[PDB]
Design an enzyme around this catalytic site. Structure first.
Site, PDB file in Angstrom:
ATOM      1  N   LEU A 171       0.530  -1.126   0.335  1.00 60.13           N
ATOM      2  CA  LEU A 171       0.130   0.085   0.119  1.00 60.13           C
ATOM      3  C   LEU A 171       0.960   0.569   0.324  1.00 60.13           C
ATOM      4  CD1 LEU A 171      -2.895  -0.922   2.613  1.00 60.13           C
ATOM      5  CD2 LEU A 171      -2.730  -1.145  -0.169  1.00 60.13           C
ATOM      6  N   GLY A 172       2.072   1.511   0.505  1.00 60.77           N
ATOM      7  CA  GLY A 172       2.706   2.364   1.059  1.00 60.77           C
ATOM      8  C   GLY A 172       4.237   1.799   1.344  1.00 60.77           C
ATOM      9  N   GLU A 173       4.884   3.005   1.863  1.00 64.00           N
ATOM     10  CA  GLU A 173       5.882   2.763   2.759  1.00 64.00           C
ATOM     11  C   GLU A 173       6.401   3.790   3.706  1.00 64.00           C
ATOM     12  OE1 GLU A 173      10.327   1.670   0.640  1.00 64.00           O
ATOM     13  OE2 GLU A 173      10.918   3.037   2.170  1.00 64.00           O
TER      14      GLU A 173
ATOM     15  N   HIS B  10       8.008   5.725   7.636  1.00 69.18           N
ATOM     16  CA  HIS B  10       9.081   6.193   8.161  1.00 69.18           C
ATOM     17  C   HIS B  10       9.759   4.452   8.715  1.00 69.18           C
ATOM     18  CE1 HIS B  10       9.333  10.504   7.911  1.00 69.18           C
ATOM     19  NE2 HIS B  10       7.817  10.199   8.464  1.00 69.18           N
ATOM     20  N   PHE B  11       9.617   4.316   9.694  1.00 72.89           N
ATOM     21  CA  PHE B  11      10.000   3.165  10.510  1.00 72.89           C
ATOM     22  C   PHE B  11       9.236   1.760   9.967  1.00 72.89           C
ATOM     23  CE2 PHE B  11      10.153   7.283  13.464  1.00 72.89           C
ATOM     24  CZ  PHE B  11      10.919   7.152  12.983  1.00 72.89           C
ATOM     25  N   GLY B  12       8.666   1.968   8.784  1.00 71.47           N
ATOM     26  CA  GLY B  12       7.358   0.040   8.425  1.00 71.47           C
ATOM     27  C   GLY B  12       6.707   0.545   7.296  1.00 71.47           C
TER      28      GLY B  12
ATOM     29  N   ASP C 175       4.075  15.808  11.627  1.00 71.67           N
ATOM     30  CA  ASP C 175       4.752  15.251   9.891  1.00 71.67           C
ATOM     31  C   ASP C 175       3.790  15.645   8.660  1.00 71.67           C
ATOM     32  OD1 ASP C 175       5.863  13.969   7.454  1.00 71.67           O
ATOM     33  OD2 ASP C 175       5.453  12.455   8.081  1.00 71.67           O
TER      34      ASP C 175
END
Ligand code: IZA
EC number: 2.7.10.2
Length: 287
Positions: free
Chosen positions: A17-19, A21-23, A136
Site C-alpha cells: 500500500l505504501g512505505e 518512516h519505520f515501517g 509530519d
C-alpha cells in the site's frame, strides 16, 4: 493463541500500500476462519533492516487515539522469538490525498476541499487535546476513506508534549519534513501545537493545488532558494521565512481561504490561529 491480537498466519498478504518512516504498509485480509469472510486491514511492519522501539511508540500513540478523522487502530500482531511487532489499522482504499487528488481534479471542488480542511483540523484539534504534536502533517499522511471523508493516517514522528509544557524538543530530526516546518522547528527543534498549525497551512496549500507535484511545497520553496545548497538548505529556508516570504495563493483559491492559510504562517508560534479557530473559519465559508 491470543484472540485479542492478530495472528500473523491469518493476515493474508494481498498488496503493498505504501512505505512509512519505520515501517511499510500492506493490505491484508485477516481471515482466521479460513472462509474469506474476514475483513481487509492495513498492516504496518518494519522494513528489511528505523527500529522496533519507534513502531512501538506509534502503536502506543494510536491505541490512545479515537477520532472520526484519525485512522482507526485495530490491534497488533506480535512476532515469535523476536522483538517484532506489526500495527493493524483500518483499510482506507483511496490512499493518501497525494495520490487521490491528482486523479480527481474534476470530481473534487473547492467546497469539498474545504470540508477536508475541516476534517483535518478536527483530527488535529483532537490530537492536540491529547497533548500530541504530529510533526509530519502533509497531504501524503492524510488518507481518503471516500470522496466525503479523510483521516490523519500516519503517526510515525508524533510526540507527546509534557503536561504544562508548550513544546517538545526533538533530539533526532533525521527525517523531518523541513518544507512543512515552522521556523521554531527549523531553528531550535522545538515543536508546539502551533507548529502543527503551520504544517496544516502547508497541507492546505497542497489540497488547493490538488497535490500537483510541480507546485509542491518542496518544488516551490526550492524555486525561491535555489536547489543545490545541500546542507545549507534549511539555513536558506529560514532566511526566506525571516524575510516574510510565504507560499503564494494557489490559483483559484479565494482570498478568504488564503487569509486563513496565512494565519497558520505567522512567524511567532503565539501569533498563529488555533485549529478550533480554523474549523470555525472554514465552516463560515461553507453554506
Ligand atoms: C505511506 C503511509 C505510511 C503514510 C501510508 N500509506 C497508506 C496507504 C496507502 C494506500 C492505501 F490504499 C491505504 C493506505 C493506508 C490504510 O488503508 N490504512 C492505514 C494506513 C495507510 C497508509 N499509510
Amino acid at each position: 493463541v491470543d484472540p485479542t491480537h492478530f495472528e500473523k498466519r491469518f493476515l493474508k498478504r494481498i498488496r503493498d500500500l505504501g512505505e512509512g518512516h519505520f515501517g511499510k504498509v500492506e493490505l491484508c485480509r485477516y481471515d482466521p476462519e479460513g472462509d474469506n469472510t474476514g475483513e481487509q486491514v492495513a498492516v504496518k511492519s518494519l522494513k528489511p533492516e528505523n527500529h522496533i522501539a519507534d513502531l512501538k511508540k506509534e502503536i502506543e500513540i494510536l491505541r490512545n487515539l479515537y477520532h472520526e478523522n484519525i485512522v482507526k487502530y485495530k490491534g497488533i500482531c506480535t512476532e515469535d522469538g523476536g522483538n517484532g511487532i506489526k500495527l493493524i489499522m483500518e483499510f482506507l482504499p483511496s490512499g493518501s490525498l497525494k495520490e487521490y487528488l491528482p486523479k480527481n481534479k474534476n470530481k473534487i471542488n473547492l467546497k469539498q476541499q474545504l470540508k477536508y480542511a475541516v476534517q483535518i483540523c478536527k483530527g488535529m484539534d483532537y490530537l492536540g487535546s491529547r497533548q500530541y504534536v504530529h510533526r509530519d502533517l502533509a497531504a501524503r499522511n492524510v488518507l481518503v476513506e471516500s470522496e466525503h471523508q479523510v483521516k490523519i493516517g500516519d503517526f510515525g514522528l508524533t510526540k507527546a508534549i509534557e503536561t504544562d509544557k508548550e513544546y517538545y524538543t526533538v533530539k533526532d530530526d533525521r527525517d523531518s519534513p523541513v518544507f512543512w516546518y515552522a521556523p521554531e522547528c527549523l531553528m531550535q527543534s522545538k515543536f508546539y501545537i502551533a507548529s502543527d498549525v503551520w504544517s496544516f497551512g502547508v497541507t492546505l496549500h497542497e489540497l488547493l493545488t490538488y497535490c500537483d507535484s510541480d507546485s509542491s511545497p518542496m518544488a516551490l520553496f526550492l524555486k525561491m532558494i535555489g536547489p543545490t545548497h545541500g546542507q545549507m538548505t534549511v539555513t536558506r529556508l529560514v532566511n526566506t521565512l525571516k524575510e516574510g516570504k510565504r507560499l503564494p495563493c494557489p490559483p483559484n483559491c479565494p482570498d478568504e481561504v488564503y487569509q486563513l492559510m496565512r494565519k497558520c504562517w505567522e512567524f511567532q508560534p503565539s501569533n498563529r490561529t488555533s485549529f478550533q479557530n480554523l474549523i470555525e473559519g472554514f465552516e463560515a465559508l461553507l453554506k
